[PDB]
Amino acid sequence: GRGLPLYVQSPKAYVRKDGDCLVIEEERVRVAEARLGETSQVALFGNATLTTAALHECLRREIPVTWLSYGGWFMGHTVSTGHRNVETRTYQYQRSFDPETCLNLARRWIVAKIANCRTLLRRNWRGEGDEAKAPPGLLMSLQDDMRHAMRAPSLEVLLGIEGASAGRYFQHFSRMLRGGDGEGMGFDFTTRNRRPPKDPVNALLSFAYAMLTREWTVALAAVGLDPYRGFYHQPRFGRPALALDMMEPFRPLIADSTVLMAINNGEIRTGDFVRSAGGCNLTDSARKRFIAGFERRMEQEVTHPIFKYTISYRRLLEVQARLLTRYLSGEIPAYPNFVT
Amino acid sequence: GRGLPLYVQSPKAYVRKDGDCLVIEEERVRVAEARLGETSQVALFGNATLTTAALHECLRREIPVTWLSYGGWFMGHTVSTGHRNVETRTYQYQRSFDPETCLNLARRWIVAKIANCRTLLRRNWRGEGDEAKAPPGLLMSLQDDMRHAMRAPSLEVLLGIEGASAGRYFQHFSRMLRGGDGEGMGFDFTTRNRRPPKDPVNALLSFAYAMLTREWTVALAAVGLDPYRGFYHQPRFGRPALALDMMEPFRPLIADSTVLMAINNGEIRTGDFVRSAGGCNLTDSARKRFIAGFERRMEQEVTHPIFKYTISYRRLLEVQARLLTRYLSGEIPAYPNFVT
Amino acid sequence: DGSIPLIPVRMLNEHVYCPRLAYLMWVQGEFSHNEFTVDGVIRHRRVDAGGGVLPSETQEDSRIHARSVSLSSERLGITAKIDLVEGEGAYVSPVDYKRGKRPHVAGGAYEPERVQLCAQGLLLREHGFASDGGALYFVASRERVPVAFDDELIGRTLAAIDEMGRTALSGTMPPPLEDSPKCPRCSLVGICLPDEVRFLSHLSVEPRPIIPADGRGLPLYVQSPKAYVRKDGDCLVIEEERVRVAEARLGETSQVALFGNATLTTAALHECLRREIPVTWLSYGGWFMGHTVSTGHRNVETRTYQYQRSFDPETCLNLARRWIVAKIANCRTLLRRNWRGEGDEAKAPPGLLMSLQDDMRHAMRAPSLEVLLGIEGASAGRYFQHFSRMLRGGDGEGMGFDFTTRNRRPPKDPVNALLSFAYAMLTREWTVALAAVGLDPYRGFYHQPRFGRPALALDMMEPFRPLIADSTVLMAINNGEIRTGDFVRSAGGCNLTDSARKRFIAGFERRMEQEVTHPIFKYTISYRRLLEVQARLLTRYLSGEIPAYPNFVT
Amino acid sequence: DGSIPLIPVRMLNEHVYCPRLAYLMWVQGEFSHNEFTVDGVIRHRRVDAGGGVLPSETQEDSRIHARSVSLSSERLGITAKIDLVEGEGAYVSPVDYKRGKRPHVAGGAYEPERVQLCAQGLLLREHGFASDGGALYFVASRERVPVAFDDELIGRTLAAIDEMGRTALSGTMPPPLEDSPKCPRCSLVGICLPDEVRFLSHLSVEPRPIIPADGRGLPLYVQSPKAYVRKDGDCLVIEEERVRVAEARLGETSQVALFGNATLTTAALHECLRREIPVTWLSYGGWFMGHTVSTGHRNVETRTYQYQRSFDPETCLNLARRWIVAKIANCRTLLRRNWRGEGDEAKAPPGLLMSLQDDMRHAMRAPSLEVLLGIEGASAGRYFQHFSRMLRGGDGEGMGFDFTTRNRRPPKDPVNALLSFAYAMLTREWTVALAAVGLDPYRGFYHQPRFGRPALALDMMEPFRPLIADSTVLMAINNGEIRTGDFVRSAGGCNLTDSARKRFIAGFERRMEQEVTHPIFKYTISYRRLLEVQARLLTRYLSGEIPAYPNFVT
Amino acid sequence: MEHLYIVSYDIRNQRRWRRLFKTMHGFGCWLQLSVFQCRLDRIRIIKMEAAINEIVNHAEDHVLILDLGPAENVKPKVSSIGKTFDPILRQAVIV
Amino acid sequence: MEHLYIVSYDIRNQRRWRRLFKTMHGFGCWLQLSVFQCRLDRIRIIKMEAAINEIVNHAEDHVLILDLGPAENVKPKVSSIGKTFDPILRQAVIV
DNA sequence: GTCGTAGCTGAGGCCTCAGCTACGACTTTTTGAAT
DNA sequence: GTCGTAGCTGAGGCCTCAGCTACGACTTTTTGAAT
């Protein structure tokens, strides 16, 4: 690597440039430094301040200043008019037309997604009292499917196999609840992913998936990448086809994990849902309680992209995106995906 | 006669109808009565009140209610839609085309005017100290001119003779001042009656003549007469040709007399005038002081139209107008003019 | 002699513009305002109405800046009130203010104002001054336009003085301008009636469309028997039982009608008088008791002609023949166009039309007024006999006409009361219109004067009875303005409730403000304007200006 | 497979209206507002945006009055969000709100909305309901117009579902409507470009006059180096030294340009972001440092085509040939029409015109990009060598051009600095316009990407340099916008005082908002609109829709 | 032909305000807290602008006169959000 | 084509007044003590009337919107007696 | 139904600004016109 | 140039009405547009 994103949490903050350094001040009193050598995007939260000289020094070094709301809602980027990233974009577009590029990254993404799913099985299995362990036949089955995904011949075969394995994971997803079937929170193994959520658990799953997709979109656009040109999913109709491509490994870690957190912590209850002729949707208070929960899961630290330094998830996303652009253009072969 | 005008001086007044009577009230307290048998125009001053029932009873009996301002400024009449007066108007118009009608009334008016002039000579002669009496040669001369006016052949001869006699009266008009020539108030014997007043005395004379003409106009219109169709003067150009015809006897009594009053009482002084290249005009304060003086002369009582009952001048005017309409249509021959 | 007063130099300005205009404005009063006269008064008022320095009698060396200076010379025969006089010591110069832009003519000043300035210049020369010039100070751009007293300019001025003198002494109003562009804005075009007099005097043209009336409002009707009309400055608030029912803006009010026992505070009466807004008192049932007048109307030629012709038999006879022939023709036309039958009755019976036309023509050949009144009675009898034929497709409940119940005091039918109210409330309109044109509404040629019914309004309303009164009654009954419930019985007869009176009066007003097309001149004119136009044309006919009165047969 | 998402039934409504419209709105995002879309949103928002009752799963007997109900069936392939659902117990009926009056057509409902209502009806039938009907509740007159699900109406609906599926899977945007009256109000006519694509695709017509742009404002320029732009709600107050210099209404602002050390409070930046108002940071001298972006532009076909064609040599070569031939032609035309000599010099020397035209044609026959760049350099050298020929009729005091001083960093002439400022301030306009149409302003076919100068704005500005930049410089010097005093020396070179920068920027703005006439389509279009139209036409050309890009040679 | 005028003022002296409220009730009808609607022909608009050039003090007051249209077609030109808007009607007063 | 609108209000609650003064500075420029002049095309007039139907309380407030004309020919339609009247001009802000 | 109405004083209600203290909006995908 | 701005409180200035007490206008004849 080269450097790391700097997150200016303090809404009080005032950021100046000190020669080769970026100085954070609080009330005319210093807080911390970045110093532009190991820097990446500078993320400014609500009503922080960035002196225009510091902004110009960021732009000249082609650093994607990003503006988040006070809470952390994304509001826009600020990119420089230099070839720093157009090289990355042209590499992405030139290489998306290739069969091994699409196929190889798709195989890696799917094997990582499956591995995260089975690791989450062995983490959060709550068939407690009599089945402390998941059926190792299931674990062997998912291992076999993982090898199959390693050696899928083409994209459509991989899509079919992916759908299969994800379904057989969701077969025991309800096995991971507070210990039994969640009567009042029913989970359907088959009505997955239809546009209106027909189950409360599926409503949570879809909402978490949408927020994860948004996070991945903004992280991808922070680096010089076009989120709407995917390698595995399909591009048009307004679908972010690269966020959808890359969020696959992170579905169990941030979406399934957030739902499990908020349902095993009693944050989400049967009274929070409204059902209408085939649609189960959250209530506003429940919606933003769940948004707070999604934050709390996005705030956790995990240590091992390939270098062990305990990043928050929201920065691990950028680390992965930079790793992707770095795989492209031929720095590091085969995009070392993040798997736990 | 039949009856007399009722003048409601009180601006407080409230006038009702009591059967055959017209009752004046002050503050729910009675003042006086008229009783409609001997009534003529009902003159209401500023913000007096006339109940609509009383108004209707006046109209049904065809009585010309007239509205004056608080001071006494005329503001309009209120005539009934009956043939009471159209008979008088049609008699006036049918009879104005006649030669003896015009000629005879003109002769009477001029002889009365001359007689009033010479009587005012014998009244107000102020050649005091050495000439207590006017030159009886002048008096004999005006008597002779009066006979000539009695036996004038036609209208133009009467006009010429009238102009002569009025001039020889104005020759000694300045003889009637505070005792001598009014240096600072010069009177011109010959520049009479030119439209701009070239002398202060002539300014007073013209202004008094105009106010007298207005009074006569409203008095004539109160009765059913057209003031704009004259017997002696000429009708068109907007000149009131019947006010001008009938004010001739009253010129010495109300206009000359008012000027003499206001100049021998010191009310009008040389400082009241502004002179401009052939025009001597009054100043505003002087103008309305003179208006007050004209009122005061119009408020005096004189007794003898033909019936001795001490009317104010402003009602003597109506008595004369009614006498005129009564001469017309053939009630009383030869219009018994008022001469003192 | 006193055959002619001194010519005001503004009338000298007008004479060189349109001799008929000078005759109207000077020999007969007869002024009226429009956009431009009002605007010019507004310009002049704020500065030159108020006086200033005097023109010094003894002038040696000092600035002369007199304003609104009144001179006259009687050797010349003119009188003036100069807007301003600018002079250095002994060389003065008249200055006349105008209102608009500099005109687009050679010299920047039209022929009239040049003559006015030259006349004022001669007047100044008379009083011992050296003028030899003048100016026109247009207030809008204050672009002083000099004028030099050229010699034949003085020739024009003296010629115009003589011409005005002769045309005033002659006593014949000069003809209108020939299809000029001056007339559509002369602010007396509503009184000159240029195109109408041209067309009827056989100088035949096609009358150009009505130069429309401007700056006149609509009446005020006070029908409530317990109303109290009081002044509130410029508005006129009508309060009933101590609550403001409605307000009427005095600038937008053209008459006032007080029905029954409605009170009008003396201050409101004074304010109406100050604007010559006619006020008419009526009985509760519409009887026209009295109205307000103010020292006569300054036009005398009109009334003199009216009376002098009134004393002429065949003039009266010809006018009466015209009038009742027009009435019978209009009765026929109404009977036709609004006959509502069902079948074999749905269109008029020609025998009735034969009788009515034969009566029209028997009246046209009448020997005297006696036979004329007889024929009018017979024809009106037939018309009313068939009148019920044609309302609501037949009589309704209670809405019963009795043809024999007409022409007498207490109405004992509903529709008889409605007709009598309409007649007695059109007589008021005609009286006001006739008194507003200088005529005397009580001296009539056909009718005789009697209380509550002026003899000339009763005359000139005869053609208009079927068109306005009867038409309003018919439209009111047919449209459902009035049904039987609206009436109340009484020992006298039938009367209307207040809800009925307000609706009926509104209907009559809508009729009066309803446009038609003149048969003769062919332009859209409201009925209220038409009454004024007809009154003016009667004045012209009596004046001997036009050959005969246009009776408005439709 | 996932080759196609579920068709939203509003896109089903649009497809039966204009298949190209459905393709644009669904397969490429690409929405824009006008009068009517905004008005319709305003109608729907105040009531049906907020939810209501749920459609009961267990329905026995009770009123169903659900609002904004989201269904979908994946057997059918559609998804909907029904405006309202009125049902008694188990017989429901979709209700769709509209905005206007009842249309003047048989049945009171046009073909599209009938199909939308039938589709929602099928969706309701899918979830276990009996609909057999629907309604259209026009909010303006609330005249509910029923619609019955006739059989071939369902035939139309299913046919349209299949048709949209196939046209989306094909990947070819259907042609525009043929001279239809639908297009002048479809709120994407600025993106469809119907008549232009018709005309250039050789379905030749005469392009109807520009359906004018609507609801777009003018930029905000912040040139003062000590300004502070802060939010004041919806305005945007620019205060300098703690005093309000000016306010800018955010609804009427279309861009923001921050020159030099001008500060923009973070709240103002957020508010600009919420409206996608582009914000561009520039050096003090106009260098384009950076701008603001937001998660890309949802149109992908445009960028995919752009890059895929960028990897094709002769496409790049043909485009570059067109571009610099247009540049040389425009240089010739400018040299002609604005040459200002005195005598024997007052009109252009034909030898120069020979050289320039021969260079035009030598470039038109270029073998590769290397020779093209060489020819561009030579022609620009000649053009600038003669550039000074034609300003103020010759060089003034200090206003000295050096033709050899072009194309490098610090400007050491006054007019060199003026040109460099104009170029660097047109590059911003082109970048914004190109990013607003979905393209990627940095991937260019001719130029190579380097800092501060996007490779595609530099490309497509080449024809427009003489028309906008050079023309603005010339008009500014000639009219006296800039004289020698306006400049200030510096160790680097020449710069402009603030009084100069404001006037020059105002001049450039006046140039951008100055109407011209398109050579090809022949309608009056402002330059700013012309940049957008040209960008869109480039997108179409790369799309393979039209044969070749129209280069705007004048 | 008459036009519909809307007149709105700011008057900075209570006496002048009385004078102007005086005059304006002379001409039109109250519409809003300091706004009058006037239906006037040419003579009366000349009168109104004559009056309000001497009622007001040109130094610090402000009177605004808007000519909406021909008073027959004003309704499409005026949109009121609170109370109803109803133009002045030219008809007699029957009460 | 843009039109010139004149907007005048009476608001009977200080909070709603703040809300409306907010919104109106969003749209036009101050003219008189409670009057704004707005130069808007169609999209923005729709926006303004959308905003002022939820800012105000229809029960007791009153907002009046007058459409003077096509904003190029408004000067003959507006006569100001006190201060000068100058319509909103559509040009960039150079300062 | 008492002079009636013009003109001035208070008490309350609109309309805006200067000066203070809280705060810390942003939410899946669809819908949205036109003839 | 320190978070910046949204939102609330006061103090003054416009705008009108209800309720009181003064009062008590009116002025000659001319001028005033239009093409």
Side-chain angles (χ1 to χ4, degrees), chain C residues 20-235:
Chain C
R20 194 168 150 92
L21 181 55
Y23 199 99
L24 294 169
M25 291 182 56
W26 185 41
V27 194
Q28 316 185 353
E30 293 282 45
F31 185 57
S32 298
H33 281 278
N34 59 356
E35 183 162 85
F36 313 110
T37 45
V38 167
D39 187 20
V41 171
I42 293 319
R43 298 295 171 215
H44 278 66
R45 185 162 51 53
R46 65 177 63 88
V47 292
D48 309 289
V53 177
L54 67 124
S56 305
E57 294 82 358
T58 68
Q59 281 182 351
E60 313 86 27
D61 287 287
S62 117
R63 178 53 53 184
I64 297 294
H65 192 75
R67 205 172 301 147
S68 286
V69 182
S70 82
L71 282 72
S72 68
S73 169
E74 186 225 46
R75 184 185 59 77
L76 301 195
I78 56 181
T79 300
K81 186 176 180 180
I82 318 177
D83 270 337
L84 188 153
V85 168
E86 279 172 354
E88 61 86 20
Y91 173 96
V92 304
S93 81
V95 175
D96 179 15
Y97 288 29
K98 289 311 283 186
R99 61 159 299 263
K101 300 289 94 175
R102 190 190 207 255
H104 279 291
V105 74
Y110 274 106
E111 173 64 24
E113 285 90 0
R114 293 177 61 248
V115 170
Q116 183 185 338
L117 267 299
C118 173
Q120 303 183 350
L122 295 125
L123 266 177
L124 278 179
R125 288 185 188 180
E126 190 62 25
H127 285 96
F129 300 90
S131 59
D132 271 354
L136 278 72
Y137 177 93
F138 295 80
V139 173
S141 295
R142 357 118 58 164
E143 47 187 358
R144 180 176 328 277
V145 182
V147 168
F149 300 161
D150 292 330
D151 197 303
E152 65 10 4
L153 184 52
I154 300 169
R156 287 158 190 269
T157 292
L158 294 234
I161 280 162
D162 247 50
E163 182 167 10
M164 201 186 318
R166 283 185 308 261
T167 188
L169 290 198
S170 66
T172 55
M173 196 160 50
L177 293 204
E178 190 191 19
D179 243 339
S180 163
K182 303 178 174 165
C183 286
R185 271 168 174 185
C186 83
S187 79
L188 278 73
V189 60
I191 311 169
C192 194
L193 287 198
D195 297 295
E196 285 85 67
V197 175
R198 288 303 304 269
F199 178 43
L200 302 128
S201 179
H202 282 339
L203 302 127
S204 300
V205 304
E206 180 41 51
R208 82 185 98 177
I210 185 66
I211 302 98
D214 49 356
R216 58 211 282 282
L218 305 195
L220 174 63
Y221 289 101
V222 187
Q223 54 84 28
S224 284
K226 64 207 186 318
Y228 186 77
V229 186
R230 55 175 202 87
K231 192 164 129 68
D232 176 339
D234 293 305
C235 294

Side-chain angles (χ1 to χ4, degrees), chain B residues 11-321:
Chain B
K12 293 18 163 119
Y14 178 76
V15 187
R16 292 184 292 113
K17 179 195 64 158
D18 185 8
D20 201 77
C21 171
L22 211 63
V23 293
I24 315 304
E25 314 198 296
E26 170 69 23
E27 276 301 319
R28 301 290 190 108
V29 10
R30 187 180 301 279
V31 181
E33 303 182 1
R35 294 216 174 230
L36 286 163
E38 293 83 3
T39 189
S40 240
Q41 55 189 2
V42 190
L44 277 296
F45 284 79
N47 287 318
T49 302
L50 183 50
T51 63
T52 55
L55 188 45
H56 285 178
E57 186 60 35
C58 283
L59 295 195
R60 281 201 287 269
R61 259 181 265 215
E62 282 171 337
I63 290 148
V65 173
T66 183
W67 311 98
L68 312 175
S69 173
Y70 174 86
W73 192 252
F74 173 82
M75 306 245 23
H77 289 296
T78 291
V79 291
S80 74
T81 48
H83 58 288
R84 230 18 12 175
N85 64 38
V86 187
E87 278 174 14
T88 71
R89 262 209 294 284
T90 187
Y91 273 120
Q92 171 203 354
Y93 270 100
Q94 169 186 351
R95 201 172 290 239
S96 78
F97 302 143
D98 179 80
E100 255 66 49
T101 300
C102 301
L103 170 57
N104 191 356
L105 282 110
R107 294 204 290 231
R108 261 59 172 280
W109 284 325
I110 298 304
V111 300
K113 172 185 180 291
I114 306 240
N116 283 319
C117 293
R118 62 173 285 183
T119 297
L120 184 61
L121 276 154
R122 290 193 315 96
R123 289 316 85 140
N124 239 339
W125 172 279
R126 286 206 39 198
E128 60 187 1
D130 62 345
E131 291 295 328
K133 300 298 310 309
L138 181 81
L139 269 288
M140 240 180 310
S141 69
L142 275 128
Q143 189 349 20
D144 281 317
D145 290 331
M146 229 168 71
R147 0 188 235 94
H148 294 309
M150 297 171 104
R151 53 188 55 102
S154 180
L155 264 63
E156 76 293 349
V157 190
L158 186 43
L159 187 118
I161 246 232
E162 167 190 359
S165 305
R168 9 181 6 0
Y169 177 91
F170 278 116
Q171 293 180 357
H172 294 228
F173 184 77
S174 186
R175 194 52 280 161
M176 289 182 184
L177 269 295
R178 199 174 281 122
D181 197 75
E183 199 274 340
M185 319 278 293
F187 180 74
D188 272 337
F189 298 166
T190 60
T191 72
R192 281 295 314 114
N193 69 57
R194 67 179 64 252
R195 299 290 193 278
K198 285 185 124 180
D199 272 350
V201 184
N202 291 50
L204 300 196
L205 272 180
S206 292
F207 189 63
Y209 284 148
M211 302 184 297
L212 173 54
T213 284
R214 164 155 196 87
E215 301 310 60
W216 257 111
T217 285
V218 304
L220 274 160
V223 192
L225 278 186
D226 201 8
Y228 292 88
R229 171 79 199 173
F231 296 157
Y232 171 58
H233 281 65
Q234 304 276 16
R236 307 172 301 147
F237 303 96
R239 303 175 289 198
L242 194 50
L244 291 185
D245 266 6
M246 271 192 143
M247 72 183 287
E248 301 287 287
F250 275 87
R251 277 188 191 251
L253 288 119
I254 299 171
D256 304 39
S257 305
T258 311
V259 174
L260 292 167
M261 276 315 93
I263 192 64
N264 288 338
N265 295 354
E267 182 55 89
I268 293 301
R269 290 180 180 176
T270 78
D272 303 64
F273 291 98
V274 182
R275 309 168 191 254
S276 11
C280 295
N281 59 332
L282 294 174
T283 50
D284 293 329
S285 73
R287 293 162 80 249
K288 343 171 7 183
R289 285 179 285 157
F290 195 58
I291 289 156
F294 180 69
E295 227 235 15
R296 274 187 292 273
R297 178 57 167 191
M298 291 265 293
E299 285 307 315
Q300 281 185 326
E301 275 81 4
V302 118
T303 178
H304 187 16
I306 206 61
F307 292 164
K308 281 71 66 179
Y309 59 95
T310 73
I311 5 137
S312 169
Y313 270 125
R314 196 180 267 142
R315 297 147 39 101
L316 166 65
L317 297 184
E318 170 159 347
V319 175
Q320 296 310 121

